[PDB]
Design an enzyme around this catalytic site. Structure first.
Site, short mmCIF file in Angstrom:
data_model
loop_
_atom_site.label_atom_id
_atom_site.label_comp_id
_atom_site.label_asym_id
_atom_site.label_seq_id
_atom_site.Cartn_x
_atom_site.Cartn_y
_atom_site.Cartn_z
N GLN A 19 0.80 -1.23 -0.03
CA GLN A 19 -0.04 0.01 -0.06
C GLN A 19 0.83 1.23 0.11
O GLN A 19 0.53 2.34 -0.29
CB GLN A 19 -0.99 -0.14 1.04
CG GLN A 19 -0.22 0.19 2.64
CD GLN A 19 -1.34 -0.03 3.81
OE1 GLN A 19 -1.74 -0.90 4.08
NE2 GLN A 19 -1.84 1.20 4.28
N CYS A 25 -5.44 0.83 3.14
CA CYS A 25 -5.64 -0.38 3.58
C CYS A 25 -7.02 -0.97 3.59
O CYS A 25 -7.22 -2.26 2.97
CB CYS A 25 -5.25 -0.77 5.18
SG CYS A 25 -6.29 0.05 6.46
N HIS A 162 -7.44 -0.99 11.01
CA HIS A 162 -6.58 -1.64 9.81
C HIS A 162 -7.38 -2.88 9.23
O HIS A 162 -7.96 -3.58 9.83
CB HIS A 162 -5.12 -2.12 10.27
CG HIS A 162 -4.21 -2.63 9.45
ND1 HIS A 162 -3.88 -1.87 8.07
CD2 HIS A 162 -3.53 -3.69 8.97
CE1 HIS A 162 -3.10 -2.50 7.61
NE2 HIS A 162 -2.81 -3.81 7.84
N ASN A 182 -1.71 -9.50 4.65
CA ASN A 182 -1.23 -8.26 4.69
C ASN A 182 -0.86 -7.43 3.54
O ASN A 182 -0.79 -7.99 2.45
CB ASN A 182 -0.38 -7.94 5.92
CG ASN A 182 -0.46 -6.51 6.86
OD1 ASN A 182 -1.33 -5.59 6.28
ND2 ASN A 182 0.39 -6.18 7.52
O1 LIG Z 1 -10.15 4.98 9.49
C1 LIG Z 1 -10.88 4.25 8.60
N1 LIG Z 1 -10.87 2.97 8.30
C2 LIG Z 1 -9.49 2.33 8.77
C3 LIG Z 1 -9.81 0.91 8.59
C4 LIG Z 1 -11.24 0.40 9.35
C5 LIG Z 1 -12.03 -0.49 8.53
C6 LIG Z 1 -13.21 -0.68 9.22
C7 LIG Z 1 -13.17 -0.57 10.63
C8 LIG Z 1 -12.32 0.08 11.49
C9 LIG Z 1 -11.16 0.71 10.67
C10 LIG Z 1 -8.56 2.75 7.45
O2 LIG Z 1 -8.57 3.05 6.34
N2 LIG Z 1 -7.29 2.79 7.98
C11 LIG Z 1 -5.99 3.08 7.18
C12 LIG Z 1 -5.35 4.41 7.76
C13 LIG Z 1 -6.30 5.48 7.88
C14 LIG Z 1 -5.84 6.76 8.55
C15 LIG Z 1 -4.85 7.66 7.98
C16 LIG Z 1 -4.34 8.80 8.39
C17 LIG Z 1 -4.46 9.04 9.74
C18 LIG Z 1 -5.32 8.06 10.62
C19 LIG Z 1 -5.86 7.00 10.07
C20 LIG Z 1 -5.01 2.27 6.65
O3 LIG Z 1 -4.17 2.25 5.67
C21 LIG Z 1 -5.27 1.13 7.42
O4 LIG Z 1 -3.78 0.47 7.36
O5 LIG Z 1 -12.10 4.73 8.16
C22 LIG Z 1 -12.37 6.17 8.54
C23 LIG Z 1 -13.71 6.53 7.26
C24 LIG Z 1 -14.90 6.23 7.83
C25 LIG Z 1 -15.74 6.40 6.78
C26 LIG Z 1 -15.49 7.28 5.54
N3 LIG Z 1 -14.13 7.68 5.45
C27 LIG Z 1 -13.35 7.33 6.40
#
Ligand SMILES: O=C(N[C@@H](Cc1ccccc1)C(=O)N[C@@H](CCc1ccccc1)C(=O)CO)OCc1cccnc1
Length: 215
Positions: A19, A25, A162, A182
């Site tokens: 990624q 992720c 994640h 992963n």
């Molecule tokens: O942060 C996330 N999702 C997480 C994953 C996730 C999936 C399902 C349940 C809980 C966690 C996500 O995409 N993580 C990201 C990191 C996001 C991040 C970036 C900058 C600073 C803080 C966080 C990743 O790459 C995980 O490795 O989504 C926020 C969101 C919600 C709805 C619309 N947009 C964003």
């Protein structure tokens, strides 16, 4: 359910990805699930586009994160069920930015009709995976920066952060375990995979499990 399942040896899982600097992720989780479900519906194993989601799914937040269930709903509701090939919409977010969505010049590699949200129960998730294939899940990955191999113990299990892909399990091992794909290159973990203990909600693995449906 069977005592053990490993979809990696059964033609259903593509190579491990990277990624990069992007918080994408969620897209690697959703697309890896679609790739597997598409193959298991009797179609050729095809490399599919995370970039389509990262740039074009405006119900998620690009390199700032997203939800696999939002992605599955956008593909059906806004993109006519289509998931483009990797070759025709290659990954472009490794530097950490999501470029503008390109709305033509791509070829459809797979289609989905919907998705299912699985129960918050490890044995029920395993039973579903044994028949229907790999499952998208969220985990708390905060302790994954220490993983070097084997079955991890004592995963910090505080807050989901994640998205990853369940590809198998083994209930017959000394310590029963999950097998997880992963998106941190093949130099990390066991050629890019991690095993975590199964049956004690390690890393909150049971809390947000789902899959696309291919008809
Ligand atoms: O942060 C996330 N999702 C997480 C994953 C996730 C999936 C399902 C349940 C809980 C966690 C996500 O995409 N993580 C990201 C990191 C996001 C991040 C970036 C900058 C600073 C803080 C966080 C990743 O790459 C995980 O490795 O989504 C926020 C969101 C919600 C709805 C619309 N947009 C964003």
């Amino acid at each position: 359910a069977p005592a053990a399942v490993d979809w990696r040896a059964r033609g259903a899982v593509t190579a491990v990805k990277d990624q990069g600097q992007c918080g994408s992720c969620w897209a690697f989780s959703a697309i890896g699930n679609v790739e597997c479900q598409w193959f298991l519906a009797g179609h050729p194993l095809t490399n599919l586009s995370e970039q389509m989601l990262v740039s074009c799914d405006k119900t998620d937040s690009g390199c700032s994160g997203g939800l696999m269930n939002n992605a599955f709903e956008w593909i059906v509701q806004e993109n006519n069920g289509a998931v483009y090939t990797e070759d025709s919409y290659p990954y472009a977010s490794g530097e950490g930015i999501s470029p503008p969505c390109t709305t033509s010049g791509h070829t459809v590699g797979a289609t989905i009709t919907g998705h299912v949200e699985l129960p918050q129960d490890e044995a029920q998730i395993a039973a579903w995976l044994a028949v229907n294939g790999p499952v998208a899940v969220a985990v708390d990955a905060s302790s994954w920066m220490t993983y070097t191999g084997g079955v991890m113990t004592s995963c910090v299990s505080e807050q989901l952060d994640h998205g990853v892909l369940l590809v198998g399990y083994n209930d017959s091992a000394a310590v029963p375990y999950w097998i997880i794909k992963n998106s941190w290159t093949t130099q990390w973990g066991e050629e890019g995979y991690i095993r975590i203990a199964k049956g004690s909600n390690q890393c909150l693995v049971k809390e947000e499990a789902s899959s696309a449906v291919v008809g």
